[PDB]
Design a protein around this ligand. Structure first.
Ligand SMILES: [Ca+2]
Ligand SMILES: [Ca+2]
Ligand SMILES: [Ca+2]
Ligand SMILES: [Ca+2]
Ligand SMILES: [Ca+2]
Ligand SMILES: [Cl-]
Ligand SMILES: [Cl-]
Ligand SMILES: [Cl-]
Ligand SMILES: [Cl-]
Ligand SMILES: [Cl-]
Lengths: 338, 338, 338, 338, 338
């Protein structure tokens, strides 16, 4: 995640121009390797045409260049690229919207589950730890960054997300599917035991707790859905072939022909194809943002800070249900009293 | 479902280029028969023009080719194709979003319905089996893959989804409509009997159970809606005629005319219509992804793994309500305790 | 509703090609009258130009044809047509999504409302009949097919949807507005009387019943909204004038001029304007699908089967609350028991 | 609101053609003044060119006309117009979707609040009158039609929406903000007093009442949001300048030049610029529908019938909570009994 | 926020034309600096070409101008600009839709929390002050205007949003993350204490209070999400480079060449590039509205009035829970009584 929201708070003279001098999460960082390969190929073809070809071969290359520049428009790169990028961005923001946040649940755990003794504190910490454990299990499933921090469930034990008893219980309950759903059943049974033990005073509070927990379950299931059900591979292949074939054609059709031959559109012989390079910038940049956001849980600069979210959720949840349980600031009249 | 999410976690040099070497769920697998038919027709027409026609007939064919290539733009293939594919993809993801998951309901069944004896266990298994039975009935209705696994309700009996008593009850309740809704009424009456029998301690938990069950009912009704209310046949016919007429025109108008005649756009005589083949790739591929996703419950490579979902839901639901009912890992202080 | 979902389950060779041989819900059935009128006008104009005009009049007609074919592009038919059709299709699926289904409510009525005697059975049947009566009142308001089956409320009495007592009560409560909302107040007061009489054991179940009933009220209000608040007439008039003026221009500008005069774009004299007829097919077909879906509650082939939905909802609701109330299949261990 | 839904129930021969003969809510009524101004300016310019200019001035005007007709395409009127109209229509239907309907709340008031005596009747009428009063306060804020019916709160007193006691209470609670939210606090406190007084039997029914009332609060807040947060003035100015500059250019560039001079595109001298007038129709009509729907609460023909909605909501709410409270039709067996 | 909704209530002759004479929130105010820079550069280039260049250099500049005006179309400014502006506007209205309003919660606090003594009043004020404090903490995080009003939490203490005890408690609970979530845990624990102390009569009302508070938590989390997860910097850089490169090209390619040389498109030598300036207006205005709305919480004219919302929410919440608690207008029969 590269944040620049405070820099664009007001519309000033050249507000977006200052953002062109960034490198992390930038278009140049995503684009420079492909651009260098394209530039090398273009100038190799240029040197071959201008030095390594005879006059008849030069005329043949000029005919081929005019043919390619006349039939480049047959490729609907904008059509397929716009569809693909719209799908990518919609799925990207939907993937952020289903990242689980335990704040409502941790408020309800800190409130409803009573007891300032060790048992009630352990109960609250265990409930919010079950929530964070289910979240970190699905994030281990869907994020390569979280999976690199926790290559195994023993890493989750060594990071405080899982107890050895929970690890043994999860090993006992092993099925050939993903086991991220297990802490939700654990939460349901532990909350039922808490209500039966008098730690939850009313079953309506139990319903509220399980409603928030099931909302988290729905969000984690949506994350599992977006990881499992990818954008269809046919679309990715088609848009890849579209961009690649467009600029493989531009390697030939955008060559500067000899201005002595007086071809239309080739009256002026520059060396740098500025408009072709700009078109490469725009189209291959569109493709590279599609490549960067299609899995926003990886290790790109503009990918989600999933490890930070995991750490913050665990720390904030434990603080909210442990230290802030019935620990209120002194209730005093405010400034606007009476 | 063809999953490649882990392969595109980071935006690297040619990240989408490695996906071009796939065959399952690929554009080539969906496209090769149509492309071979089109290529055969194109080269038959080419051989007829270059070998089987006299000079006057060749001139007539050249006039026809120029006419077709000048009036090919009258076909708005991109317009209707973009509309149709946008509708297909929206309905496709809406169809995935209403695939039922019993995880929230199975958590509430494992928690709320009490009793470690045989009666409470049978009650929990029967409730979550009613949920899975309604889901598998609507999936038998909407998916050809599920219908091929279970051609009859006796197959559902032989697969453990239905008891013979439930089969006889469903035969008694026969109406000329789809009977997928029956296990929801069964769930409601069984949950009411469980609450009246003391197995459910409070009616608020009964409300939670029936809320989750009715959410599953809404999802299954949406699946029934998408199976019944298809994309209107007029749109499918129009987009089919658009693509087919476009490339039937391209069979004539994209022929390489004799370069001795010096027609504009026909100065260079290639043999392979590379740009026409690319246009076929893009447009007919758009059409074939529309054909593949319009019913995502069939047996295509990128269709939903409905049988796997059915098996996983049944197994996970039975494990959650049976073996995990009040079976908790030992509650111990975590690493960050005190 | 024309259903073809099972025919397009898999992406096969020419999957959409087999759908071109349909007549019900087809593009040809929606298009043939307009196409015949257009073809007759085109060939009348052609015969007038080629037989009924002198040489100076033929030259004037050629100038007019070239002028019309040069300025046909000033009409943005694709722009307004795409906007209108997107609006039509969005409203069409929103209108289907708010068609009421009483299945969740009938499950809650079959469960919550107790009593296997005649009074409780009559109570359950009356409640679910109030739900179906409100649904059929709003569907009589919004659907011409339902209004043709039930031209009056006495037809609803003769069809079992309304009792004569309910008919007299609705006549007493007459106001100059639509009275579809009355059975919701009837349901609320009858459910309150049922809870006060002990037929509903807890008020939380009463809340669940009224929540489902009010969800049905929201759906029926959305149907009333879509019937009352039409797409603005200005948009319909503009898109109609766009299509009509486009092809009234094409009646002149797409005429095949004399190829002896050697006009550009008129070198080859066909008789059938194949591309103009294809453009008519696509654009006037887009217009005709917009005409067919703008009111999906009429009597078109692809319109909603509202009478079937009404009959199925009534029959299934009465069966669910009457014969299936506390009528459960025998609870026995499943195949995967222990 | 101009309703024509019943006229377009079926797709017939020229279904949309009959709608071209309407005047209320029509494109001609919205367009004729601008079209007459444009036609007068066009023919004044035509008469100046053909009568008031010398040959050199005529040649200069011809150069200017060709320049304007060659550079008219630099204006992206379709781009900005499509964006603006899409935003307008989305906000228009969102504004209709948040028009409050008290039907669910009036059903819950008629059911839950008990007492056929004068006190319970007054309580029910006061609660549903608080709902209608909050709705009419926000509609007075957002609609010029409602504000013209009720220029002051004393008009609301004289129309039965407000009592003099409520008027004095609202005058006492005066703050420099809009006071539409006050009847929601009144409803909450009155419903709490009703539950404490035994008129509401259970607090779960109180929760249902306040949930429906808060749903109405959310809808009224959305209406306040759409009235306050307008479409940004920059967009309106840009689309206005786009349409106006396009047709100010068309005043010169679409003039019929002298056909003796044999300019391309000016070979035929008509008098009526039919395609320019059609383009004016489409583009300025798009602009005028955007002008008509941007505030759908005004006094246009296709604007919402807000006063009718207000009157219907008040009358239907008072009838539902007053005359229909525990006033049920006699419960008798239906036609399909046994 | 610049409001003009009342001025566009009806579609009149030139309704949007009167809005062109505004300055606050106008396109000219957002555009004039860039337009002056562009005009200065254009006329500097014009004077260099017409005065500072020799005939061969003038011919070279003419070739460069024709080359740039022929290859300007290679830049897809409309494509990327439409995508970016659609994303900006969608995120802008989503950011407004998640601005928290405490009105439902303040109604529930005024109703449910009982006691006209000092303790109950202090309790209600403290609860709604916790709601407003969490809202103002997240608005301090996301808005530069709110942050300028309250540079520190001591400013929130001096503005009555925070007590010194709450300030010390927040200092004690310091973590390296944003602490806007703390008043939600405070609200949960205080509401639990209120229910345990008898100030809240039933736990169902406690559930309603915590549901509204958690809805506010979800809205504030969405605001935190939109502040943190910016539109990807790659998109902003690409659209900035697109607009800037388009008009840097237009600095050369849109120059008026010598009409004596008789270049096509340069037959008439104006001085003011009216269509280029209009294109600058439209495209750079699209970019500037994107710059203005990307952070709608800054200090632009059309940005949200966040400080006004904060002040109004605090004042209205304190009035609703303090002065309006069980302070009802006298309940009297209305005009339509009997
Ligand atoms: Ca990534
Ligand atoms: Ca398929
Ligand atoms: Ca219809
Ligand atoms: Ca209006
Ligand atoms: Ca701003
Ligand atoms: Cl879920
Ligand atoms: Cl449903
Ligand atoms: Cl409603
Ligand atoms: Cl609100
Ligand atoms: Cl949240």
């Amino acid at each position: 995640t590269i944040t620049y929201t405070s820099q664009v708070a007001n519309a000033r003279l050249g507000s977006f121009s200052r953002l062109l001098l960034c490198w992390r999460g930038s278009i140049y960082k995503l684009l420079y390797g492909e651009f260098l390969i394209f530039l090398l190929c273009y100038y190799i073809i240029r040197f071959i045409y201008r030095l390594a070809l005879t006059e008849e071969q030069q005329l043949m290359f000029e005919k081929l260049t005019l043919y390619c520049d006349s039939y480049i428009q047959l490729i609907p790169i904008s059509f397929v690229l716009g569809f693909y990028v719209t799908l990518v961005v919609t799925r990207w923001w939907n993937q952020y919207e289903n990242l689980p946040w335990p704040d409502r649940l941790m408020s309800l755990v800190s409130g409803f589950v009573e007891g300032k003794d060790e048992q009630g504190r352990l109960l609250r910490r265990t409930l919010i730890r079950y929530a964070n454990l289910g979240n970190v299990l699905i994030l281990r499933s869907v994020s390569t960054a979280v999976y690199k921090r926790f290559p195994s469930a023993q890493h989750l034990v060594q990071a405080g997300f899982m107890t050895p008893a929970e690890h043994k219980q999860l090993e006992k309950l092993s099925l050939p599917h993903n086991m991220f759903w297990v802490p939700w059943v654990w939460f349901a049974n532990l909350s039922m035991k808490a209500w039966l033990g008098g730690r939850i005073r009313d079953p309506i509070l139990l319903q509220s707790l399980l409603n928030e927990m099931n909302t988290l379950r729905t969000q984690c299931g949506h994350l599992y859905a977006y990881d499992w059900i990818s954008i269809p591979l046919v679309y990715t292949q088609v848009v890849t072939v579209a961009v690649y074939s467009f600029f493989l054609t531009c390697l030939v059709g955008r060559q500067f022909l000899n201005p002595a031959k007086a071809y239309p559109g080739h009256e002026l012989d520059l060396v740098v194809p500025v408009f072709t390079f700009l078109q490469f910038f725009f189209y291959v940049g569109w493709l590279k943002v599609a490549e960067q956001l299609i899995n926003p849980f990886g290790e790109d600069d503009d990918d989600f800070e999933t490890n930070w979210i995991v750490d913050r959720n665990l720390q904030v949840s434990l603080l909210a249900v442990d230290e802030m349980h019935q620990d209120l600031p002194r209730m005093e009249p405010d400034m606007y009293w009476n």
